[PDB]
Ligand binder design. Structure first.
Ligand SMILES: Nc1ncnc2c1ncn2[C@@H]1O[C@H](CSCC[C@H](N)C(=O)O)[C@@H](O)[C@H]1O
Ligand SMILES: Nc1ncnc2c1ncn2[C@@H]1O[C@H](CSCC[C@H](N)C(=O)O)[C@@H](O)[C@H]1O
Ligand SMILES: [Cl-]
Ligand SMILES: [Cl-]
Ligand SMILES: [Cl-]
Ligand SMILES: [Cl-]
Lengths: 223, 223
């Protein structure tokens, strides 16, 4: 019920990080599905060439519209209502919220850029939704796609523990409070005593106030 | 001259995306170095256990300070001036700028969180610099570390073509203009004529104004 199609010239990168731990076992269980399309296999030319120099001059290469179009058209023949997305620094900033909106579609397609990007006609023709994972420049869209997929699949019911998932949701808009586990003492540093009292009321008070204080100090924008 | 130490419970994920294309060949050439430390190998216990339930209650698990400390101390014995960083949603927002500051150190260590995070004592004792790659929740720090490394290594001289690199720098603070390559016509859509005239002056004017218009429409914050 959660299908992601990844379009990439590096299919052997995938599943990669998406293949371990909860994501990976949820993938084996079939709680989500990952289809990785190799863009190169859709190159009709005798060259097998996916990229070419840009019209107008300037350095680098650009993914071609004909190759991309064949690949995307294949994806559309298989999944005609897929939500078409393009990893791009030029796109809207990915957030937990965009992640949730993205999941209201149950079939999502992520095009991974390489080189200097893709021919603009592909973006306009297919109305690709451009998405940036942040204000930094990656070498390719593959990491961005993995980031988007991990974020989304983490919220598919059954992928992570229910309690963890509910706690994560309820903490949204706040920074995580300090957390501790064994050993009791480490390099002479001890765990705050309240957390060792079993006093649920006081522990929860302490956590709320720590989160509140940390949030105001570092992410006041989260109000 | 650019050394990254990645601390992770999933060493087999790496190099992964960092191992392909320019990053990968620069890694083989030795323009940067990647040391992936397996946190599990530093678990002294008979259990081989890196994580444990948090003091004070609440769901999930947390990476232990004793295990992390042994691993990080090993890293410090080898690289005593390494810049210690921790992937965390609670951290400062990674940007091209933080990436450049990060590169003024030539030895960087990235701790990858898993589960609910790590024992806070580790953050305070080692003064870890917390870094978020965006306002979304990943399953682990590994993708964040890859994102940080890719961003940084992309600016190491010799990793990508000089011309591309200079163009990227000069376009900072602006959104990328529309780009085109062959074929001339695709699904009845043609390339803007100015880009086919060879007129460098007019092409550059057109690009500047497209970038300016797109930036104002979507990222006015980039002034
Ligand atoms: N922050 C980011 N978010 C999402 N995708 C990104 C990204 N940074 C790079 N990419 C991906 O990596 C590819 C190559 S980078 C493109 C560089 C180009 N000079 C430009 O400024 O746009 C992009 O096409 C895109 O798919
Ligand atoms: N946006 C982000 N940037 C950097 N690291 C992130 C991240 N999202 C998750 N992580 C990493 O993934 C690990 C597990 S997620 C931790 C979840 C916890 N409830 C919390 O809110 O902090 C984190 O310890 C961190 O290393
Ligand atoms: Cl591949
Ligand atoms: Cl569909
Ligand atoms: Cl592993
Ligand atoms: Cl050092």
């Amino acid at each position: 019920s959660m299908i992601f199609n990844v379009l990439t010239i590096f299919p052997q990168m995938f599943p990669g990080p998406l293949g371990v731990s909860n994501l990976g076992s949820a993938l084996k269980k079939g709680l989500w599905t990952l289809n990785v399309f190799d863009i190169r296999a859709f190159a009709n030319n005798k060259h097998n060439t996916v990229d070419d120099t840009p019209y107008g001059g300037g350095p680098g290469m650009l993914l071609r519209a004909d190759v991309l179009g064949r690949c995307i058209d294949e994806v559309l023949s298989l999944h005609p209502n897929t939500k078409l997305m393009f990893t791009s620094p030029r796109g809207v900033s990915f957030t937990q919220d965009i992640a949730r909106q993205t999941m209201n579609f149950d079939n999502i397609t992520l095009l991974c850029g390489r080189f200097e990007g893709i021919d603009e006609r592909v973006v306009d023709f297919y109305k690709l939704q451009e998405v940036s994972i942040g204000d930094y420049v990656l070498s390719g869209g593959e990491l961005a796609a993995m980031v988007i997929i991990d974020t989304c699949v983490r919220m598919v019911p059954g992928v992570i523990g229910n309690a963890e998932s509910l706690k994560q949701e309820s903490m949204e808009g706040s920074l995580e409070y300090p957390q501790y586990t064994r050993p009791a003492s480490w390099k002479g540093m001890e765990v705050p005593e309240v957390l060792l009292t079993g006093n649920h009321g006081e522990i929860e008070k302490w956590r709320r106030n720590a989160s509140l204080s940390i949030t105001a100090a570092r992410r006041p924008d989260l109000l």
